[PDB]
């Protein structure tokens, strides 16, 4: 039914990155936005290959911008959009650029930055080289802002995620508690034997002393 | 940033693998290990999850004589550190 | 507007409910009922009660009911309530409990059924003696639009995250306790071994 | 009803008390403990939260010679067990 299969999708990048967001309000601000890069396949056909990117905020849980691209429609964005790459290595290079955006100080000669421009119904994300008055788009991508339906589905996916992580943590907590109980019991055993040996040593010392 | 220090392969089987990593001092809620044929799209590597306390894992169902990609990712809250990966052939 | 920050949860458990809809056929599914008593952020003296029907299987299933004390007086005349606004949750939980502990051998056969007809949903708990059916409580729930379901998912994710951080702290605490026990064990075995070598060296005399 | 069926007041000082419950058979991630004077009509009871690992809790700052209703609720991830309530004067 649903196009993309998130259940068996692979997460390659999930980290906050500094992003400049521009809107018609003109309230230009730098916010740290969480980028999740996913490679997966469609549930309709195992041959259809999809890459999807999610831009979210841990501060605003209702902020979501999505990108979904197949292998076929990849030709439209391979030309006319950014550096030459195949569908396979496009994630790798985009990840490298995002990482460069994270470790980006003014004194960096290739000061790479990331900008998300949101205009009404559409948003365009571009990573740009910005030194000596140059603005050079290394990557330019188009993102769909979240409707209530897709943000709802995203929230549900993250909720199930957190539930699974926390159940795993509960299993680990029970195991560590068992390990600590075993360790304290072994500690009691050792101390009891040490007290016994000190007793025998003191008795031996008093016997020799006489 | 390569959250697991270093990775090694220890198993020697035709259908499976056993991988070992080392325990980073950062907070890790879980590790995800991906195994897929080299050169593949990577959106069909069948991920599986390992607790953050553990440093070892077993893979199964592999075809012998194929180049498989083994990647370890460690996850924090609201984040995932950069992975470290090795490839091996059966 | 209700303030969940200072609310108290009185019942939060899956309940056996038979849900019948016009689009899909009759099924019995286990649904999660959350009953909350709290007060408004506009007035801390004003009392509101909220009930949520969700599914652990379907995270997009949400039906909500929230009542003030005044319109609860209106519903006291609308359904013959004979108890106060305070103890009404108790009766509701008891009714739900009767559905929870309900088997075919039960003579009262207390049941829960929820029918959704395109914007309107009524939840009813019923006594079923022979064929006669007496609904002890009948309530009207507005199904969730995507906006309120979205807000519900966000709040519930914040809850799971907070409880999970508390568990993470406890896990770190137990791990530290285990490390302390390992260190004390090492100290104990060390002094045992060295006092044994002292035992034998004093045997050397 | 009460999932632990075992709540009592165990230590007692004029300004403080110690409560002990028993709910280890089920998985319990946390407990919420509510302590307030009046029975019902509760718009000022002080709640505090306790990890599921604990089997004890201390309340302090209580008014001497007063009647307190104390309730313990145990929570799971997707559920809340039935609570247990006691009345004590200190």
Author numbering:
A (entry chain A): 13 to 222
B (entry chain D0A0), D (entry chain D): 2 to 91
C (entry chain B000): 15 to 219
Tell me, in the authors' exact words, what the paper reports.
Centriole biogenesis begins with self-assembly of SAS-6 proteins into 9-fold symmetrical ring polymers, which then stack into a cartwheel that scaffolds organelle formation. SAS-6 proteins contain an N-terminal globular head domain followed by a long coiled-coil, and a C-terminal region predicted to be unstructured. Moreover, SAS-6 homodimers can form higher order oligomers through a weaker interaction between two head domains from neighboring homodimers, with a ~40° angle between the two coiled-coil pairs. Here, we developed monobodies against Chlamydomonas reinhardtii SAS-6, characterizing three in detail with X-ray crystallography, atomic force microscopy and cryo-electron microscopy.
We found that MBCRS6-1 recognized CrSAS-6_6HR but not CrSAS-6_N, indicating that residues in the coiled-coil are essential for binding in this case. MBCRS6-1 was crystallized with CrSAS-6_6HR harboring the mutation F145E to prevent the interaction between N-terminal domains that would result in a poly-disperse specimen hindering crystallization. The final model in the asymmetric unit (ASU) consisted of three copies of the MBCRS6-1—CrSAS-6_6HR complex, arranged as homodimers that complete the biological units through symmetry related molecules. The interaction between MBCRS6-1 and CrSAS-6_6HR was similar in all three copies, extending over ~947 Å2. All variable regions of MBCRS6-1 contributed to the interaction through hydrogen bonds, a salt bridge, as well as several van der Waals and hydrophobic interactions. To determine the impact of MBCRS6-1 binding on CrSAS-6_6HR, we compared the structure of the complex with that of CrSAS-6_6HR alone, which uncovered a conformational tilt of ~7°. Although small, this tilt is expected to propagate upon higher order oligomerization of CrSAS-6 and potentially result in a ring polymer with a larger diameter (see below). Furthermore, measurements of ring diameter revealed a slight shift of symmetries, now including some tenfold symmetrical assemblies. Together, these findings are compatible with the suggestion from the co-crystal structure that MBCRS6-1 binding might result in the formation of larger ring polymers. MBCRS6-1 binding to SAS-6 does not impact its ability to form rings or stacks. We propose that the resulting ring polymer adopts a slightly increased diameter on average to compensate for the strain imparted by the increased pitch; this has no detectable detrimental consequence in the cellular context. Moreover, MBCRS6-1 might stabilize the SAS-6 ring polymer, since the head-to-head interface is present in the co-crystal structure despite the F145E mutation, in line with the higher number of centrioles observed in cells upon MBCRS6-1 expression.
